[PDB]
Design a protein around this ligand. Structure first.
Ligand SMILES: O=P(O)(O)O[C@H]1[C@H](OP(=O)(O)O)[C@@H](OP(=O)(O)O)[C@H](OP(=O)(O)O)[C@@H](OP(=O)(O)O)[C@H]1OP(=O)(O)O
Ligand SMILES: O=P(O)(O)O[C@H]1[C@H](OP(=O)(O)O)[C@@H](OP(=O)(O)O)[C@H](OP(=O)(O)O)[C@@H](OP(=O)(O)O)[C@H]1OP(=O)(O)O
Lengths: 222, 222, 222, 222, 222
């Protein structure tokens, strides 16, 4: 992470040990579940890429998942290099402009990453960009491991609409798909894969029922 | 959040990462349960709107619930604007008076939010007002998801009064209803939806029995 | 809470957010169980009444229990007022002597509460006194909710003495009763409500057996 | 605990509230289990006797166990007094030499305890000595409450050697006995109280098999 | 651990108590499981060998495992001594060069360990080297205690590929074996020890199927 000192200067305040342990506990227990994506974002707020690489290193034991994340980072960096090409030869006496691998923290030191993070002329947020690249790698793992496709998800005959909705949405989240497919699924596949007892009522509600009105009406129905 | 420095000046001390992770853990596990409302209030004490927006952003994945909360904030702000209209043209060289969206932190920076929070002439508590608007959005979600209406709640024949009371009140909390309906329900629906074995005794207690005397008398009855 | 600065001066360092969340978690999960009493004492060490009122406010949703605690505080304060009556008219230029509601923090500010807490002439520990008043309110709730009276508690025929002792004592704790009734119960009701197989041995031990010798002798008996 | 200031001086930094809550949670849940002994040691590192007495006070509700611990402290102090008798009349203008109850923190203030802890001429570690006395009291409670003697511990016919070893050692730990009895038990009672299917193999291993070779060989056997 | 002061000087900031408690909780609950290896690495980041010895001391009660770790440290140190032999007689007025046991922290003080950790001429990372030696001792314990060999691991007939893969990999991790044996096992033993229903499909996928394509294809198959 980064701390400030009198005069407008900046320094490094390393990610703490019990914050890294928590990241490890969220990954080991939830096994790269959907919640692994947000837990990471928060435990990484105010931190720099070097420390994001330490967090991943502590969980490096997982290798199928860390292979997927590593692949993504290399790609995004290449695109950064393509759309932000070397401006030209570098005038000396200054810090080079950030390249794709520096955002990652593999070829670059934390101080250079902090100088960009707090560069008066044009500060580059090296820290937030890398977290996002890593979050696409974590999200793909969730979809890879997701145990149930949404089409299979259904309601126990005596099971209620709320728990079924909870399970149906859990999967829709991990199955990123697209937001429009989600709208069709949330307004139809929920009613279609439901049992008939609460469907009659989900149909009575009307057309384009909202979830607030689908849950209120089916409370106790079955 | 906000920190003070020598001379009476103020600065920003960002909400910490493991406090945001906890907010995420309370939402992911309890699934916008009733306890999500208080956990938030406490994890947000001493914090400013910008940081309240970060907490919500980490849990932004939940979208049906964050749609309900977002709707409420826009409304309250409009009412703030209606009852606290623009005083007139703004004399220059000073900070504008707070508008509805500034309390939210969408159109306004933290420093302006802190200057109001600690404005010597008329300090506006931008931070506490927004938390309350958000808490009405969270509370509506609890009632939307509540799995059981109180009328259905009853006592297992061999189940005791204490657990039944615990389940009956859990729902009464989430079903905000009104405090008077609560008094009628707490003094009648509890006895009526109970089994007859402990009801005989709940009737022996007398009229307007208090809970302290309804629980003491039915300890072991059944 | 209270912090000290160069010169012998004192200031306020508010109870932290994740300490308040823990108090909320202990109350929501244990449901005003016996452990709620000590958790509170510890999370309130070094804190002042204002902050004790914030902790209770976060859990204010619980109302039957907060009605019992509120009743007790008003009483103790009245007794404080009765045995520590207004000394007389107050010489001006100084802080008034503490009244019953100031100990609570309802009519008084934290600074006045801290000035008494650290008054050189006669410092009044406003903070510890209020916590105790609140702990009597919390303890009454535990006894109100206690699910099992000790007389009913018995040993499963195949159940051991240790678990039965654990359950028997759990209730004796919550059923404050008096320490002497406890001695009679701990030396008799334990043996009497036990099964006969381990009682024969609890009788062989001798008269006035101690728990250390009642548990050692019945390890494996049944 | 103890903090240092410019000039070589020392002060008191009280044990924090959420560290005391954890000690309470480890005692309430594990019920003076074996792990209560180490949890305490760690939560007490850098702390002084006064703060060790606060930790015990928060859990003072438990009284059979706190009676056993209290008895031990009085004894050890008496032995300290016997082998470290009053040197003679005390020259004035200095701090007295530590007595048995001062190590406990009952008759002595924290500052005196810190002056000894950091006495240039002959610093007495009042803090660590008392923790050890308390740990003998906690360890006796574990053995008092231990639910199963090792001789009874055996292997389910379909149960594996690893879980049986885990249960057999759990008890051997709490049953301090002596290290030699432990060696005889760990090399024999484990094989003798095992089922015959894995014993044949535990015998094939050879004589004086080590645990590393008893567990590797019986992995899958049964 | 180590802190820095004005002038470029360094000091010691001891490992905190609740960080040591967590290490104890991870060892007591997971019982020297695979996750014990990473939890340790993180809770030890920024710490020095003396503090790594305190963490191990708190869990010293476990003795079969601490015998395995202790054996390894002695060996690695001997190899350090062999490949980094005494340079010769030591010029006086300086700190000796680090020996094998100093890296451990048994014969050496923290200040000397910190002077090497931050030696301008040739800083020796005494802290990280010892953690690695300890991690080989912890990893051997995991393999010793591992309850299931991978060959036995199979898929319940109605069990899915994902959970079976999770269990199969859990063991492959703890059974360090070699990375090549892992590739053969991950591409064959998974399919071979699977049930026939999902194997038909795992065979349809093609030759050298990747896990991402073995999990996607068998989602719902069985
Ligand atoms: O606020 P956090 O980001 O969670 O950091 C906490 C916080 O210390 P700070 O207030 O200085 O940030 C804790 O205090 P509380 O917020 O709970 O009041 C403190 O715990 P203690 O008060 O018990 O000391 C703990 O410090 P530590 O882990 O050394 O005990 C430290 O956690 P981090 O060191 O990981 O930042
Ligand atoms: O013991 P740690 O490894 O340091 O983990 C702690 C532990 O959380 P859990 O009870 O969920 O395991 C703390 O509880 P205690 O050890 O103090 O009893 C809790 O701190 P609080 O009780 O004050 O809430 C905090 O959990 P959280 O941050 O979610 O509130 C969490 O710290 P980490 O999340 O950083 O691991």
């Amino acid at each position: 992470p980064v701390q400030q000192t009198g005069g407008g200067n900046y320094i490094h305040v390393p990610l703490s040990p019990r914050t890294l342990n928590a990241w490890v506990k969220l990954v080991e227990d939830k096994k790269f579940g959907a919640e692994v994506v947000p837990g990471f974002q928060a435990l990484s707020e105010g931190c720099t890429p070097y420390d994001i690489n330490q967090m991943l290193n502590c969980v490096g034991d997982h290798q199928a998942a860390m292979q997927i994340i590593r692949e993504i980072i290399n790609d995004e960096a290449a695109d950064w290099d393509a759309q932000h090409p070397i401006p030209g030869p570098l005038p000396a006496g200054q810090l080079r402009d950030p390249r794709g691998s520096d955002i990652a923290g593999t070829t670059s030191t934390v101080e250079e990453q902090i100088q960009w993070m707090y560069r008066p002329q044009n500060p580059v947020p090296v820290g937030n960009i890398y977290r996002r690249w890593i979050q696409i790698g974590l999200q793909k793992c969730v979809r890879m491991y997701n145990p149930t496709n949404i089409l299979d998800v259904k309601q126990g005959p005596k099971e209620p609409f709320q728990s079924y909705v909870d399970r149906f949405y859990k999967s829709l989240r991990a199955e990123q798909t697209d937001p429009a497919v989600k709208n069709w699924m949330t307004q139809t596949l929920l009613i279609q894969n439901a049992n008939p007892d609460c469907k009659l009522v989900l149909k009575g509600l009307g057309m384009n029922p909202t979830l607030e009105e689908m849950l209120t009406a089916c409370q106790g129905v079955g």
